[PDB]
Write a protein that binds this ligand. Structure first.
Ligand SMILES: CC(C)Oc1ccc(C(=O)Nc2cccc3c(-c4ccc(CN)s4)ccnc23)cc1
Lengths: 99, 238, 289, 49, 38, 238, 238, 38
């Protein structure tokens, strides 16, 4: 079920369910991050896994995030999606997140 | 394999060259009512190819500001062809449906439609205590438009609507969607004029965009009733 | 394929891949299938023998706990001058009034269950004399039966209605009602109209009508007034559930309909279900040391 | 980089989805903080009338 | 313990461990492969 | 037999000519985590000889007024060698430990050290309601000193501390102590930067004394991590 | 078949939808050092998934005037992650490499990159008798640029460089290249700070061109060490 | 007497007479003798 990743002011309604990507002129730039808190309010809360899990206190097991690219057929690109196990701050550079 | 499809029912056929497989709702296929589930004791009429064929609705224009569209079943078909005539002359109806949604654009267009079949899509009104009236619900062949697709017009969630039978038309990937719906009711048959089992919702979660010269980008809906049965013959309500 | 699942699945160890033509992390969301990528295919894994049970998320366990469905307070007094619940009340039975039960039930399209009903009564003196150990009568009045007009009307003789008589000093009164729909399941949602004319109610399946609960104090009034509160609890049991639904996000407005407004601002606003963060690059609870 | 020709839209969207895998487990049921009421709902009183 | 004559009077039935999640996760007519899906 | 010992782990070896046997805590030996107890599903790194080797800490001087010394594990090793690097780059850690404590003096010296490994040595503060802070607990490689060894700094009892895995260095008898610690936690693995499984305490229950010319009498601590595993690779916290 | 590829090593995975098969250098696959070829007698550390995973370098911009780029192995990785830590703490190293080069453009772009892995790419200087210095060779993670790619900066020949393990990225055909490198040395192990076994060279033999609106066209390099072994543990040179 | 469906509901389990005091009294790698210990 869709994550509300664009939970920002000036994103209204349906606009909150998508993230817009543009061509950049600097290499290896950060595009977005996703807070992984299901208990605190965040992109995961209003999801099927999220809503059902909030009837419970304890959880275990793996999650899958799937991303669908919805540009035109002629659009091309490569993204790197990173999960960082806990302990420090969220990485802000690609060569940190790549680890 | 998964990309090309032909559907043939009665005197009607559809081909697509950009399918994305197709959905059978909850893994079921339409069937006729068996004797061990039947209630009404009169012998049903089963018109077969006269009813169990694709009917094409009026197309809708996809625009930058579109909120999405909906049609209720059987309501949208209750006045069309021999399906409509049997609906009007019979107290009781049962069928499945084959839904095929069509939308094509160039390789320079982008956009994504969620095509979702919702069982018992009981609508809410916005910002009132008064329940939706008859003319808010019973749109017929023309269908309706979403007021607040973000909550599915029922105080709920577009984001979680993938729990229902659905496909996407992502213009980059595919240009049609197909959903097969079984009979989906608490009773074995129903009065077709006062209850809708299914609502087809088409919602543009990613808006239509391009930098080519603009064209009208229509969305077209073709629905085949499947395994139609009718009971309780009388005069036409019509 | 249908299988008996008692515990979460084991993880198998996995090696390095590098195979041409095999891309298990790529998917096609447009089909409407959920991603089939396994963890063993995304990363190198160890073997884990997984012993975590799944019984607490069984639908029977998720729904079969007792929740408040009705709560009514009324004056127990000499009512000759009152204009009011005159030592009795009538309740039209529904599940839509208290939102915690309502939201859980509305996760499904169809439900079949028997209802365990627990009736809890409490009393306070009106503004002390001690608390009277009153006898109450609850009577179930089905569709088309006559409801009592008065505390002492002959409808309470209950020749064929089911009644339970219970004391305030007793444990809560308890009875089971069977699954009583005229269909094979209740319609939790109903995209339809209740009558053959156009003016019938939208959104309530006539097939799911339970009836009325009538509760009186059986005692005559005392010389002083009391306030009596009756609480009704319902526990579904022997449950079947079909077609799971997206949960309710906006506050409920009415028991009669799905109408919606939202909160004034996020969370759970009509424009914004999740509360905002400054940007899609902002981590709100970022660990810093 | 995202690279597009002149006739494609210069800006493109991702939709992100999440689910659990089948190694997932939940425990200790609680009242969900997603719903609440401060008042009686409209027409909840009328059920007593 | 159930001495009532009606079977609906019994306590809850918490023993049904059958699942088929594919009716919600994989309602595609041609099953997925573990392999390009389209 | 019991008096001489050699310990060899990786590129490191220790010999002693005055051991007093050695202690295996609760009769266990270190082991790797088996599959039927494992939680984290990623494949662990097991560096073996890069981590599972003796590291020697800074020596402490035994003095007439000494109250005793303590070090917390893994905290004391979290910045040392390849053990420290794996700690800093991984979310999860597990290991046992081999502890070897060294102190020699002449045949004219007297003194007795209790060498005790305490699991979950949650410290108290003296004469305050405020709990110990981060810098009171996390001493790292240098370790700490006992404030009130008589109550083990936790409102308890030095006298009953023999309930924990321990040896003595009685200068008349022996000049080294050895304790083997298994993994000792309620979870199968832990975050090494916020929890200490073990505390090594060295307490001079009989003070150092002699009438020879005085010399510096150091106490030296060598610890080998054993069966190290790390899970949850990311960037270094460091 | 040959067009789509997934590579999974440790916690890292890469997918490509436009591969052109992939190269195994001289038909070899990486392996650990067998006992009948081993020299150093200490037990090696083999960190597996902590080292044997993709590291992504900084991207370079493809421009009309580009001469091409180079990176030396292990030098480019000697400061990255747990591979870098093991490099700094150990005298001896051995590994293979998995090299994956990424560059995408539109269907209106043209350009061809030769992606070649050169063993022992001993560089020359132009127009001097003085040999290249340490800072001319040891570029680390950033890599270098070709001065005279036509002679491979070594008085030799780009035209004959196809004698080395290579692929092309022809923007019309494919958008990634993959080369698997075995251990390639005259000794069974080496000191990683003074000798480079392999040089990755990316040279634009056909320049980038289009008549669409211009975009930044980056080239990205991801390298996985394979079967890493380290011997001779000591303090970190770092 | 236990008619509840969850086994943790049962009364206390006072029947476990297994001991191994040597894990606290004799954690020496070479066992003591009944004989000079050092
Ligand atoms: C007097 C005594 C002998 O009998 C009774 C009889 C009934 C009660 C009482 O309140 N039941 C109840 C309270 C609330 C709900 C129900 C339901 C529902 C199932 C699905 C629904 C959606 N529409 S509703 C069914 C039967 N009952 C209910 C209490 C006592």
């Amino acid at each position: 079920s869709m994550m509300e990743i664009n939970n920002t002011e000036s994103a209204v309604g349906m606009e909150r369910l998508k993230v817009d990507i543009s061509a950049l002129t600097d290499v290896d730039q950060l595009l977005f991050n996703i807070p992984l808190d299901i208990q605190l309010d965040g992109p995961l809360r209003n999801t099927l896994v999220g809503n059902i899990s909030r009837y419970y206190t304890h959880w275990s097991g793996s999650l899958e995030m799937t991303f669908m690219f919805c540009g035109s057929f002629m659009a091309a690109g490569k993204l790197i999606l990173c999960y960082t196990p806990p302990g420090g701050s969220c990485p802000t550079t690609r060569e940190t997140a790549m680890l | 394999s998964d990309r090309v499809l032909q559907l043939k029912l009665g005197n009607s056929a559809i081909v697509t060259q950009e399918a994305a497989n197709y959905c059978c709702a909850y893994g079921e296929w339409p069937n006729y009512l068996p004797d061990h589930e039947a209630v009404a004791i009169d012998k049903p009429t089963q018109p077969e190819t006269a009813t169990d064929r694709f009917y094409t609705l009026k197309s809708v224009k996809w625009e930058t500001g579109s909120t999405g569209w909906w049609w209720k079943l059987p309501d949208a078909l209750n006045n069309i062809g021999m399906f409509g005539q049997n609906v009007q002359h019979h107290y009781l109806y049962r069928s499945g449906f084959l839904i095929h949604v069509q939308c094509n654009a160039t390789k320079f267009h982008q956009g994504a439609l969620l095509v979702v079949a919702i069982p018992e899509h009981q609508r809410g009104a916005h910002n009132t205590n008064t329940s939706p009236g008859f003319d808010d619900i019973m749109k017929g062949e023309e269908g309706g438009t979403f007021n607040h697709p973000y909550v599915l017009d029922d105080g709920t969630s577009l984001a979680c609507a993938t729990i229902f039978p659905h496909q996407w038309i992502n213009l980059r990937t595919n240009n049609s969607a197909t959903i097969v719906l079984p009979w989906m009711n608490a009773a074995p048959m129903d009065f077709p004029l006062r209850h809708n089992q299914w609502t087809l919702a088409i919602i543009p979660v990613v808006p239509l965009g391009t930098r080519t010269t603009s064209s009208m980008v229509p969305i077209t809906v073709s629905i085949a009733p499947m395994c139609c049965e009718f009971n309780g013959l009388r005069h036409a309500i019509t | 394929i249908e299988s008996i699942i008692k515990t979460a699945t084991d993880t198998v160890k996995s090696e390095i891949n590098a195979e041409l033509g095999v891309v298990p992390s790529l998917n096609a969301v447009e089909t409407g299938a959920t991603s089939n990528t396994e963890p063993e295919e995304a990363i190198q894994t160890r073997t884990v023998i997984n012993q975590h049970g799944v019984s607490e998320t069984l639908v029977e366990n998720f729904l079969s706990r007792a929740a408040l469905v009705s709560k009514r307070s009324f004056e127990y007094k000499d009512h000759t001058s009152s204009t009011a619940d005159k030592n009795f009340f009538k309740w039209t039975i529904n599940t839509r009034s208290f939102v915690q039960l309502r939201r859980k039930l509305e996760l499904f399209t169809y439900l079949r269950f028997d209802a365990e009903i627990t009736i809890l009564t409490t009393v306070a003196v009106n503004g002390y004399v001690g608390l009277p150990d009153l006898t109450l009568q609850a009577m179930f009045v089905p569709t088309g039966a006559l409801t009592p007009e008065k505390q002492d009307s002959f409808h309470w003789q209950s020749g064929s209605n089911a009644s339970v008589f219970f004391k305030i000093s007793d444990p809560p009164a308890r009875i089971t009602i069977p699954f009583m729909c005229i269909n094979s399941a209740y319609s939790v949602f109903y995209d339809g109209f209740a009558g053959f004319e156009k003016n019938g109610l939208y959104g309530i399946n006539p097939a799911d009508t339970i009836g009325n609960l009538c509760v009186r104090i059986v005692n005559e009034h005392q010389p002083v007034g009391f306030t009596v509160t009756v609480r009704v609890y319902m526990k579904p049991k022997h449950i079947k559930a079909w077609a799971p639904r997206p949960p309710r996000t906006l506050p409920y407005m009415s028991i009669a309909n799905a109408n919606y407004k939202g909160k004034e601002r996020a969370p759970n606003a009509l424009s914004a279900i999740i509360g905002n963060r400054d940007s899609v690059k902002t981590m709100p609870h970022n660990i810093v040391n | 980089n995202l690279i597009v020709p002149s006739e494609s839209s210069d800006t493109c969207s991702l939709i992100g989805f999440i689910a659990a895998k089948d190694d997932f487990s939940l425990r200790l049921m609680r009242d969900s903080p997603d719903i609440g009421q401060l008042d009686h709902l409209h027409a909840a009183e009328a059920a007593y009338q | 313990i159930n001495f009532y004559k009606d079977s609906y009077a019994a306590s809850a039935s918490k023993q049904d461990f059958s699942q088929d999640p594919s009716k919600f996760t994989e309602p595609v007519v041609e099953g997925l492969k573990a392999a390009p899906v389209l």
